[PDB]
Each structure stands twice: as C-alpha cells, then as structure tokens.
Amino acid sequence: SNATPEEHFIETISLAGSYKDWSYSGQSTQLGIEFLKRGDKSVYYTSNPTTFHLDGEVITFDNLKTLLSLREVRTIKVFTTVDNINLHTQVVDMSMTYGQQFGPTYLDGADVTKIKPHNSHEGKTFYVLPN
Ligand SMILES: [Cl-]
Ligand SMILES: [Cl-]
C-alpha cells in the first residue's frame, strides 16, 4: 500500500538518520517507536493509526514539522552577582538576551544586556541588579 505523507516522512528520516538537528532512534518503547531525539526531547509514533507524540501529547503531522524546525532551546550555567562578593549559579536560556532574563547585565564591566548567551560564557560571572 502506498506510503501516506506521514509514513513517507518517517521512512525517509529512518534511512537518512536525522531530520535537521534531530537524531533518528527507531527504538521500540511503551510510548511507541522513539522516532526523533534532540536534547532531552523525544518524538514518538504509534501505529494503526500513525500518530505522533511529544511530551505526553498527541501532535498532528503539520504541527510536528513546525515543532521540529523551531530553534532548540539550549542553556548554559553562569554565576550572577549583585556585589562581586556573593556568586549564585544560574541557568541561562540561550534563546533570550541577558537583559531579557536578568535586567541590565555586565560582564567584566562590558554591558551584555542586548547580547545572547554563548558557549564561551559558561562559568563566567555576570553583574546584575538586585531582584
Ligand atoms: Cl510521549
Ligand atoms: Cl548576541
């Protein structure tokens, strides 16, 4: 029987080994076939009928393609300080500026309010206003 667009998408990805920055798995689990993985996220599919699942929710095929192409939300860890005495280990969303997450932010005196976090910032100390 001729592949549906959903089945064709799965089969093509299973042969190529990935879809953009998602890795093909193919592992059979209680949640269905582990289809695509990116960081801590796994898309599954069940059969009869072909149904996609992410984070305990059924997602349609059109909505899956949108979600797969969204930029991955990545994080780094930094220290924040209000005083250069007391440092707090803080997770940073790499999709947002320092300013969006912390308010006005300096790194060794340089204003990084408008800057996006980068890997090279991991473990650095940022000076912020008190909350
Ligand atoms: Cl799930
Ligand atoms: Cl930037």
UniProtKB/Swiss-Prot annotation:
> Would you say which domain of life the source belongs to?
Viruses
What membrane topology does the annotation report for this chain? Multi-pass membrane protein
Question: Can you give the residue ranges of the DPUP domain?
Answer: 4-69
- Compartments (UniProt record): Host endoplasmic reticulum membrane
Q: Which reaction does it catalyse?
A: Thiol-dependent hydrolysis of ester, thioester, amide, peptide and isopeptide bonds formed by the C-terminal Gly of ubiquitin (a 76-residue protein attached to proteins as an intracellular targeting signal)
Residue ranges of every copy of the Ubiquitin-like domain listed in the record: 73-128
Outcome (variant: residue 46 to I): In strain: Mu/B.1.621
The entry summarizes how activity is regulated as:
Inhibited in vitro by GRL-0617.
Task: Summarize the protein's role.
Answer: Responsible for the cleavages located at the N-terminus of the replicase polyprotein. Participates together with nsp4 in the assembly of virally-induced cytoplasmic double-membrane vesicles necessary for viral replication. Antagonizes innate immune induction of type I interferon by blocking the phosphorylation, dimerization and subsequent nuclear translocation of host IRF3. Also prevents host NF-kappa-B signaling. In addition, PL-PRO possesses a deubiquitinating/deISGylating activity and processes both 'Lys-48'- and 'Lys-63'-linked polyubiquitin chains from cellular substrates.
**Subunit-level organization:** May form homohexamers. Interacts with N protein.
Q: Under which name does UniProt file this protein? A: Papain-like protease nsp3
Q: What is the lineage of its organism?
A: Viruses, Riboviria, Orthornavirae, Pisuviricota, Pisoniviricetes
Give the shown range, full length included. Answer: 1496 to 1623 of 7096
